[PDB]
RNA sequence: AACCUGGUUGAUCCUGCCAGUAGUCAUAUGCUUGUCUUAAAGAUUAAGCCAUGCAUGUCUAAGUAUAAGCUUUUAUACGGCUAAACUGCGAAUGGCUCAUUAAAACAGUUAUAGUUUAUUUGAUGGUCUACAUGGAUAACCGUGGUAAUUCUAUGGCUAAUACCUGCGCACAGUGUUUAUUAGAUACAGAACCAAGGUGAUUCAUAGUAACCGAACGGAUCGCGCUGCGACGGAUCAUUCAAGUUUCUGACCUAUCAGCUUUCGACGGUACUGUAAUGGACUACCGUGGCAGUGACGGGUAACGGGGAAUUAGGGUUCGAUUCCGGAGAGGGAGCCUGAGAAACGGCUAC
RNA sequence: AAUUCUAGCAUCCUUCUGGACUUUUACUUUGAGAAAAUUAGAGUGUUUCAAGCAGGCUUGUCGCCUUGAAUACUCAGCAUGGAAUAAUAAGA
RNA sequence: GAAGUUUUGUGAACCUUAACACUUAGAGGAAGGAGAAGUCGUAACAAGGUUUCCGUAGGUGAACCUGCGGAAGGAUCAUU
């Protein structure tokens, strides 16, 4: 009541962080570009994915060196919400991490090449006219690129340059274009787009087809266009967003563990 | 027509336009009626004539009285499941609802579809979209139709 | 204070509504400034957000747009003439929205001489062009000008803005309110 | 494990209850008790009352240093380091409890074209003595009052990212307030004269005519013709939110059947008020609204849900209590400051 | 060849290049979206076990298993394929 | 821009009356069950010595009795 809540609790955290039940009563709380449940804070990358830090203390000792950057910019706050399709860049080690969705429905820092780690994609939420009658995009990231093409519509991605501010490569939202899912049940799945239903009132949905010919649906808010009909602007994680079945995921896992 | 103490005037039309009439197109797959365009009535709260969006829900039901001015009340009927006995149960809710004077001769026991809008008074949230003439015999509140 | 909420007062059934909560600041109202004629005074009320909302208390003057001619002049007020809601507000001269008011009309008469040169009671070319471009003036407005007054509807909310603005009455609105002035007489 | 034995008769077969039996990751209590791992615990009745101590404070190269402080390096404005004090930000989170409360709250499901939003993230913007404007305030020094406290007066100095003013092109910006034009779209054209965006708008935005000062357009700070970032503040998104809001859903009770209204009950017009929508409130006007599918009223040893116990299936009972809402700080009521409180480890009154 | 689903032909629409019409729902099917904890449950010798979400290989050192922590479950509401059943509508 | 002050609204608290709710005293009256054994009958169970019972009415120490109309749960499934 009475104002914004400064604590978040463990358990009442998101499940896709995979913070454990014991070993803490509270969990780190991420406001930044991204939402609370559609992001992951910079602490649980460093300690609970990348395994650089042990403790919450040690993440302060890393981040206040000014070694961590995101989007070619130094972020000093340890609880910064670093979300979908943000680049992370550490100068020592000289390795870069683009955050994608894993096929199971988790965040994972996908390691990438140095030339690839310049650019990143931003799907545009809407397009809107600012003052002096100038046009302007706005993104899922909460950037606002201005003077686009007239070409560029809602619900489609743009390759940003990052080294400079400006856009470079557009993409369109149509049938036969590659598209990852960012939320809901089918998260972490990439497939070409077959068809979308309108439903003139609320909630457009899209059916789309995995590269092993599995068909599945999501709302348009969740869908995020990568690239053209086959091929893709970005590098993909392990499995490339197929999501193999429950008995298959059993068989591959226990076949691994026997060595 | 000027019934009231204040001058009833349609916003949308400027004082420069004093012949011209404003009419909105409400959308959502609902056609604008002809008597909205042709006639000379005002209504602030009409979907087709004045400032009110329709947005969110749409509700069908049976009209049970049309006594109060520029407003009706619409009996919704529905079955309620009772999982122990594995068996249904007839309930109702009287939604009170605005209607505009484009719809001439809205009789008791007519069918009427009605979209949600901002709260216009305490009881009414919904506004009319479209009506249909049908007879009903004896009492209207007895008449159970599910839609 | 003044509670705007629906937790007090009856249900549609005619039943008392249970209330288990104390009044909330976001369910606020405030005492109404029945603002009037006089020399100007205005009070900044600090509202929710931090945002300021300026309460009128006495207003002499206002910006009033003639619609047809497409001009607006700053003008002094004389008196409140009619109100739709309440006759007590006319009795005290209380400015509110939709309230019909008297106006000097010497700003418009000076403009109408200067712009057109038909009047009431190198350029010349510019005046002629303006006349061709836009001056017949209704028969009732011709009679109305002779007194040194006009009639006009207050369009702004003085309580929120801290400002009396309006527009001049013309055509059907003007013919309408001339009935209900004459009817009480 | 989908389970059954004893008791009415001189005896039998029934209906039928009483008693037995088992579980509780439910309390209490008796007797007994060697070991290690995990661990509920002033909820039930008295949301009865409280001694003492503690639970909210906070400083970077970067707001203000003349401690009549320290420290060895010795600096004609300012060597650093810093008590104290002013300014900024926080104190509205967390924690505790379950007395209220029965279409209320809450749950899932919409809407916000009906709105406010510190901060974060990204945008934007020359248009109105400019080598620099003003005078007071602590701590400090001198000095008192009172029995007594986080009581404080008089006198003397001095600061600012405190407080208040305030020129400016490279008539004239942005914002506020009203009026008002454009904001096109199922087909091709011919002759004559004087192109954003929604399912959807009065939306975005541009243009025209004026309005006010009551708001922005940097009199700020550190490292180093020239880079980096600290702070301030406006509008627009964004994020953390919050406020309302659509639909559907609850235990017992009819030895509760008719409730609601001139003092808002249901609706209409036009104000007012609010962050905005509304009988939310005020004028006039109409006579409505709910109910036998349970209105209105009463009871609860009732906060709601996620859940818990219970060995076929269907169910029955519990949920003060780890998470998410809600409400409260002895009882009621009022209010300041702020982005946010009708706050109680803030204030005023009974 | 059984068991699914589907095009034709016995006189079977079309306005276009997937949606519009077939009275309307219920019903059933698949799909969306819906916090975790708890509950069932995949994997794993916490010495067993209640648990927990960890671990496991190995004289190699930018360690590897491009490591795991799956998945189900959550009336009313939104969407959709369908020939019965049952309401309901009607009667150029 | 202080003290003080005018009129409004928000409105604690206290009091009068009334109603509703819930505990609680009461001379006397009059129920039910328990004792564990008393006094007076004998009503029912057999045709229980006047068959039993129902509804209603009146009367009497008490069970009960009688009037009118029913029932077999009767002591008769039965005879121009």
């Amino acid at each position: 009541a009475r104002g914004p809540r400064k604590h978040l609790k463990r358990i009442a955290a998101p499940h896709h962080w995979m913070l454990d039940k014991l070993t803490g009563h509270y969990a780190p709380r991420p406001p930044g570009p991204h939402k609370l449940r559609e992001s992951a804070p910079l602490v649980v990358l460093l300690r609970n994915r990348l395994r650089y830090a042990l403790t919450y203390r040690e993440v302060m000792m890393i981040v206040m060196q000014r070694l961590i950057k995101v989007d070619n910019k130094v972020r000093t706050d340890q609880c910064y919400p670093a979300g979908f399709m943000d680049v992370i860049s550490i100068e020592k080690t000289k390795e870069n991490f683009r955050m994608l969705f894993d096929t199971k429905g988790r965040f994972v820092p996908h390691p990438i090449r140095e030339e690839e780690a310049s650019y990143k994609l931003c799907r545009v939420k809407k397009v809107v006219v600012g003052p002096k009658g100038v046009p302007a995009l706005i993104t899922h990231d909460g950037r606002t690129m201005r003077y686009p093409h007239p070409s560029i519509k809602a619900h489609d991605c743009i390759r940003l340059d990052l080294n400079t501010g400006k856009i470079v490569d557009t993409l369109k939202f149509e049938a036969g274009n590659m598209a990852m899912v960012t939320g809901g049940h089918n998260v972490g799945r990439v497939g070409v787009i077959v068809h979308r239903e309108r439903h003139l009132g609320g909630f457009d949905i899209i059916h789309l087809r995995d590269a092993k010919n599995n068909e599945f649906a999501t709302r348009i808010s969740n869908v995020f266009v990568i690239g053209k009909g086959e091929k893709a602007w970005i590098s993909l994680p392990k499995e490339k967003g197929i999501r193999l079945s429950i008995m298959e995921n059993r068989q591959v896992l226990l076949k691994k563990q026997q060595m | 027509v000027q019934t009231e103490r204040a001058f009833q005037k349609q916003d949308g039309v400027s004082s420069l336009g004093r012949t011209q009439r404003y009419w909105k197109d409400v959308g959502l797959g609902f056609q604008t009626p002809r008597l909205a365009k042709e006639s000379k009535y005002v209504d602030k709260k009409c979907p087709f004539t004045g400032n009110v969006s329709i947005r969110g829900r749409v509700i069908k039901g049976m009209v049970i009285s049309t006594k109060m001015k520029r407003a009706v009340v619409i009996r919704r009927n529905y079955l309620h499941f009772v999982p122990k006995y594995s068996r249904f149960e007839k309930r109702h809710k009287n939604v009170t609802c605005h209607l505009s004077p484009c719809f001439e001769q809205v009789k008791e026991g007519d069918i009427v579809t009605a979209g949600q809008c901002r709260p216009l008074s305490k009881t009414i949230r919904f506004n009319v979209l479209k009506v249909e003439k049908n007879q009903v015999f004896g009492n209207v509140r007895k008449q159970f139709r599910l839609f | 204070g003044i509670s705007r909420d629906r937790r007090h007062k009856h249900r549609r059934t005619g039943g008392r509504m249970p209330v288990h909560q104390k009044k909330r600041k976001f369910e606020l109202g405030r005492p109404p400034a029945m603002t009037k004629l006089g020399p100007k005074r205005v009070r900044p009320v600090r509202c929710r957000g931090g945002n300021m909302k300026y309460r009128a208390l006495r207003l002499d003057t206002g910006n009033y747009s003639w619609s047809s001619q497409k001009i607006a002049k700053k003008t002094r007020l004389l008196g409140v003439v009619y109100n739709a809601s309440n006759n007590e507000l006319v009795r005290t001269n209380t400015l509110v929205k939709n309230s019909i008011v008297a106006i000097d009309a010497t700003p418009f008469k000076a403009w109408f001489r200067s712009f057109y040169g038909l009047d009431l009671g190198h350029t010349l070319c510019l005046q002629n062009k303006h006349r061709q471009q836009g001056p017949k003036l209704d028969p009732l407005l011709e009679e109305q000008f002779n007194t040194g007054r006009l009639l006009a509807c207050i369009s702004s909310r003085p309580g929120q803005s801290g400002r009396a603005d309006g527009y001049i009455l013309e055509g059907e609105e003007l013919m309408f309110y001339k009935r209900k002035m004459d009817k009480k007489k």
Side-chain angles (χ1 to χ4, degrees):
Chain A
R2 307 168 59 194
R5 298 182 185 75
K6 305 299 191 190
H7 295 77
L8 169 140
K9 225 151 275 276
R10 267 163 192 269
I11 295 158
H15 195 245
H16 73 270
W17 297 352
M18 312 185 123
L19 300 184
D20 75 314
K21 195 164 63 145
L22 268 70
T23 77
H25 217 272
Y26 304 94
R29 189 174 211 270
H34 298 281
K35 300 186 174 292
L36 197 79
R37 300 190 174 180
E38 293 280 293
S39 189
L42 188 51
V43 302
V44 309
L45 274 82
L46 270 43
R47 68 220 272 276
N48 294 316
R49 291 279 173 284
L50 297 162
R51 301 279 206 285
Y52 292 126
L54 299 165
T55 61
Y56 183 77
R57 177 156 187 75
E58 286 176 46
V59 175
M60 293 198 217
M61 293 162 174
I62 298 159
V63 74
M64 294 281 169
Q65 301 283 100
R66 306 198 165 184
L67 292 165
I68 299 166
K69 300 170 81 185
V70 301
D71 314 315
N72 305 323
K73 265 113 184 172
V74 176
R75 292 283 176 277
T76 56
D77 191 61
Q78 73 202 303
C79 298
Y80 180 77
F84 184 63
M85 287 296 303
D86 293 36
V87 182
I88 296 155
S89 186
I90 320 302
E91 292 180 51
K92 296 181 182 176
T93 73
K94 311 185 283 184
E95 77 203 315
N96 304 320
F97 296 112
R98 188 176 284 173
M99 281 170 287
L100 292 155
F101 278 106
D102 203 282
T103 192
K104 301 291 181 67
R106 305 171 287 193
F107 270 112
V108 65
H110 187 54
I112 51 160
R113 303 288 289 184
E114 73 195 311
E115 193 165 46
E116 199 189 309
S118 298
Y119 74 90
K120 54 155 275 175
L121 285 65
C122 276
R123 199 206 77 172
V124 311
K125 189 170 158 186
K126 59 183 282 178
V127 57
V128 67
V129 190
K132 315 289 177 63
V134 309
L137 286 12
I138 59 174
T139 60
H140 78 107
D141 199 66
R143 296 173 175 284
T144 163
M145 300 295 141
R146 49 175 284 142
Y147 301 124
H149 291 85
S151 314
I152 297 160
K153 228 169 158 182
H155 305 93
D156 54 72
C157 77
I158 305 169
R159 181 203 279 253
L160 297 166
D161 199 70
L162 258 62
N163 292 113
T164 58
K166 298 167 277 289
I167 63 160
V168 179
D169 264 45
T170 58
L171 192 65
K172 291 176 63 50
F173 178 76
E174 278 190 309
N177 286 304
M178 196 82 79
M180 194 166 276
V181 185
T182 61
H185 188 269
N186 296 308
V187 56
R189 281 160 63 91
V190 297
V192 281
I193 304 176
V194 178
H195 189 240
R196 67 192 299 282
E197 299 189 285
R198 293 278 173 176
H199 302 112
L200 296 165
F203 296 107
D204 297 47
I205 58 169
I206 316 157
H207 299 92
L208 49 288
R209 193 185 296 171
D210 202 81
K212 211 161 278 293
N213 309 350
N214 297 307
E215 306 191 313
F216 66 103
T218 37
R219 294 174 167 173
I220 65 170
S221 59
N222 296 318
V223 173
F224 190 103
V225 282
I226 296 159
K228 295 196 82 68
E230 318 306 310
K231 221 229 176 185
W233 292 134
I234 65 159
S235 61
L236 290 167
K238 181 167 72 182
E239 214 188 309
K240 314 190 175 179
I242 293 158
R243 188 149 149 185
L244 55 64
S245 192
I246 294 158
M247 194 168 176
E248 292 285 297
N249 195 60
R250 182 169 144 72
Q251 278 176 27
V252 72
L253 188 132
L254 71 96
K255 185 61 166 61
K256 192 173 68 166
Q257 288 181 318
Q258 71 181 52
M259 309 289 285
Chain B
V1 68
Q2 306 301 317
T3 57
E4 228 112 63
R5 293 177 66 76
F7 187 68
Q8 296 290 291
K9 56 179 183 162
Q10 202 190 341
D11 200 69
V13 180
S14 303
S15 300
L16 262 291
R18 299 290 163 77
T19 310
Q20 190 164 37
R21 191 189 171 76
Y22 176 79
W23 56 273
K24 192 170 157 187
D25 202 285
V26 77
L28 210 77
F30 285 94
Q31 196 172 46
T32 310
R34 199 193 304 160
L35 213 132
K37 298 161 194 180
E38 295 178 305
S39 193
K40 211 78 175 160
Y41 77 89
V42 177
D43 212 319
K44 190 179 76 174
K45 302 175 168 174
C46 179
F48 310 102
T49 321
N51 279 326
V52 46
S53 53
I54 288 175
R55 42 148 197 74
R57 299 300 201 75
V58 274
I59 272 171
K60 205 173 277 166
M62 193 84 75
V63 174
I64 58 160
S65 60
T66 62
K67 292 196 164 57
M68 74 202 97
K69 192 166 72 64
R70 300 161 161 285
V72 304
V73 45
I74 161 166
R75 180 144 173 167
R76 304 182 76 209
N77 298 98
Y78 59 97
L79 300 169
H80 174 246
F81 192 64
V82 184
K84 174 161 181 199
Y85 305 102
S86 199
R87 273 186 185 77
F88 293 109
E89 199 192 70
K90 303 205 318 200
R91 287 175 189 256
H92 78 286
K93 301 289 240 187
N94 295 321
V95 176
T96 33
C97 187
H98 191 81
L99 89 316
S100 312
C102 59
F103 298 105
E104 297 197 311
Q105 312 302 329
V106 177
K107 204 172 277 284
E108 202 183 293
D110 291 13
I111 299 158
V112 65
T113 53
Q116 195 190 338
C117 71
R118 72 172 197 278
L120 306 174
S121 74
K122 193 174 94 173
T123 202
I124 74 190
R125 305 270 172 284
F126 294 82
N127 209 323
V128 73
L129 278 157
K130 169 194 82 198
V131 292
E132 187 248 48
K133 297 282 186 280
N134 65 299
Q135 297 185 316
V136 298
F137 307 109
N139 206 327
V140 184
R141 300 189 174 183
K142 289 190 277 168
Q143 196 77 63
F144 179 82
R145 207 196 293 200
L146 199 65
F147 302 98
Chain C
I2 303 301
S3 70
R4 285 189 294 93
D5 63 345
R6 211 177 274 140
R7 294 195 277 91
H8 90 282
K9 112 183 285 191
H10 285 61
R11 295 162 168 177
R12 67 183 289 182
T13 57
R16 162 197 167 179
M17 197 164 177
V19 51
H20 49 288
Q21 335 162 4
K22 299 189 173 181
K23 307 194 159 187
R24 299 281 187 258
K25 189 177 239 296
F26 53 76
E27 299 153 16
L28 173 67
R30 276 139 180 173
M34 296 198 176
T35 197
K36 55 189 83 199
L37 299 176
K40 189 167 77 182
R41 163 189 296 171
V42 65
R43 299 288 185 76
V45 181
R46 180 258 145 74
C47 309
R48 197 171 187 191
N51 300 312
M52 292 284 175
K53 200 163 74 183
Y54 301 94
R55 197 80 56 201
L57 300 167
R58 313 153 175 179
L59 295 166
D60 190 54
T61 187
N63 181 51
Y64 294 94
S65 60
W66 197 305
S67 302
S68 185
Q69 305 305 324
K70 310 198 182 69
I71 54 132
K73 296 288 183 197
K74 195 185 80 178
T75 310
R76 184 170 163 182
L77 288 168
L78 289 80
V80 185
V81 200
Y82 185 79
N83 200 312
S85 302
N86 206 328
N87 294 296
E88 292 163 53
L89 300 168
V90 174
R91 201 168 188 176
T92 52
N93 296 312
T94 311
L95 302 171
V96 291
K97 189 175 168 194
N98 224 288
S99 191
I100 314 312
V101 288
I103 265 168
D104 283 31
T106 194
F108 299 115
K109 191 169 168 186
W111 181 85
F112 199 85
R113 290 169 65 78
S114 192
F115 193 85
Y116 290 122
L118 298 168
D119 311 344
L120 291 161
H122 168 121
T123 60
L124 307 171
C125 266
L126 266 189
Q127 300 210 23
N128 282 340
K129 304 169 183 176
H130 284 296
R131 191 169 64 180
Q132 263 48 0
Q133 210 71 347
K136 288 192 289 295
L137 212 57
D138 291 300
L140 208 145
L141 286 165
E142 192 172 47
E143 186 62 52
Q144 190 159 34
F145 261 122
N146 216 312
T147 55
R149 266 178 193 75
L150 293 163
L151 282 175
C153 204
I154 298 283
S155 203
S156 62
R157 301 157 67 77
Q160 273 64 56
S161 63
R163 197 174 292 182
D165 277 23
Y167 63 94
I168 211 77
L169 296 181
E170 192 166 37
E172 182 54 54
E173 273 184 64
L174 185 58
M175 290 280 169
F176 174 73
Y177 289 120
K178 287 277 286 202
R179 296 276 189 284
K180 300 189 177 187
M181 225 76 76
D182 196 66
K183 185 69 186 298
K184 195 75 173 178
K185 191 165 65 56

